[PDB]
Amino acid sequence: KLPTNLAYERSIDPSDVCFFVVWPDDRKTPLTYNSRTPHQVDFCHVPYGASHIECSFSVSFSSELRQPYKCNSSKVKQTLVQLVELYETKIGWTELATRYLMNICNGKWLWKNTRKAYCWNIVLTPWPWNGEKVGFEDIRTNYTSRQDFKNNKNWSAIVEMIKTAFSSTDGLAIFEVRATLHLPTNAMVRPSQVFTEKSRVFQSTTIDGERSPILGAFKTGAAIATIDDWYPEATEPLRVGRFGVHREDVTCYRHPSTGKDFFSILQQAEHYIEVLSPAQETINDMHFLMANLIKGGMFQH
């Protein structure tokens, strides 16, 4: 098992985020910050007189989880091809597609910029699509649980077209996303920060000539992937990794002494063909196994 060369490619493709300042006269400018001074400290705020703040990125749902990228062995080839093909039938792509979509819908990718906000609205723009712009208005007081989304006019088609994008070979689904944040006057905005191996240096880009912060493309890929609450006695959803690492406290769950990490389940691949040919925990760890093949990564020793 694990024959020294195995790797997958990712299946979710988020981009950078861009901050624009809309004026009352329907004019949009890029949100620019200030620097203060080696030792350098940055400061960003909403300019006075502005209505609200806009954000736009894009994400794609492709099908690179059906076969690996390099495989080195035709016994780990047809085994992992059969697992993703049997999970499509007995379980279905419903429980994963709903969890990834809600973190796009409820503004989870706005990390700490929603605290002290009056109202924010999020508009999707799917493709391929015959119909209308999809809306999610006043999300704090209208959309809070899995059921408020299921009452929507356009939830049956956007849980769909991701389910086909994982099931059909050479599939594709692309979402444009836009959000408007009604923040109070002179409110602070929190973008991503440059690493600077040992403060608060912003990750910037050039939009229309002047510099503007981004809040990252690996930063917004972490927010969508927080769907993991199958580690034992789970209280909070974590980001999908091989050893269940939590960031705020520097512990990690999912440790190999427990027997619940990825490399002690991936070795057990032949065991799970038998049951799927059971709804207690043999399901609740394939949701962790499928969310690792959608993640990517080199799997080799």
Binding site: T29, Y33, N34, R36, F43, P47, G49, R211
Partner: protein
């Protein structure tokens, strides 16, 4: 013929801002009961990073400096020996020579302070004509601020955590025959009065 009251700031675990303010807040209660204008700033061990221990008190009428010194703070901090009284000595007339002045420019640089500013410029242009926008008001990218050793202070009347900003200027051998104010100054309405340290 000035005096000086050298203090000693000993106990090795102590803040340099909260104790230089509270020894000045007990000076701030003064000049609201005995309204004088004569007591200065005079840090002997000012340095660049992490200002040191000693502060002093300088005046020419030079008997209120002991009247200020017994005002329910050294009579309240006496036994657990944080500080001690100096020897009340005439200042020798050849020494180093600095000046302490409130800058107050730094306070109107922070992003809340510039929104505090362009709010005021909105209303005082009530003589009409143009219809201006707040779009053409910005701080650009670059303000290089080295060091100013801020001193935080709570307001007397209300609950505001305001702050002071005073730096070093050492020249000009003749201004200010003891024309200080409530906090001790070299900027406002009188002179740029230097200090003999």
């Amino acid at each position: 013929k000035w005096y000086y009251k050298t203090i000693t700031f000993l106990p090795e675990l102590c803040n340099n801002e909260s104790l230089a303010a509270k020894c000045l807040r007990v000076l701030h209660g003064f000049n609201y009961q005995y309204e004088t204008r004569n007591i200065g700033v005079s840090f002997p061990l000012w340095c660049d990073a992490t200002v040191g221990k000693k502060i002093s008190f300088v005046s020419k009428n030079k008997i209120e400096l002991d009247l200020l010194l017994k005002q329910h703070y050294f009579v309240q901090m006496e036994q657990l020996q944080y500080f001690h009284i100096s020897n009340t000595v005439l200042v020798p007339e050849d020494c180093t020579y600095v000046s302490f002045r409130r800058c107050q420019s730094i306070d109107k640089l922070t992003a809340a302070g510039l929104a505090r500013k362009i709010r005021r410029l909105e209303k005082r242009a009530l003589s009409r004509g143009e219809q201006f926008d707040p779009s053409s008001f910005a701080q650009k990218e670059h303000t290089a601020i080295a060091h100013y050793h801020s001193l935080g202070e709570s307001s007397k009347q209300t609950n505001r955590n305001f702050r002071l900003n005073i730096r070093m200027l050492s020249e000009q051998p003749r201004e200010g025959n003891s024309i200080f104010s409530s906090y001790g100054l070299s900027n406002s309405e009188n002179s740029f009065q230097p200090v003999p340290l």
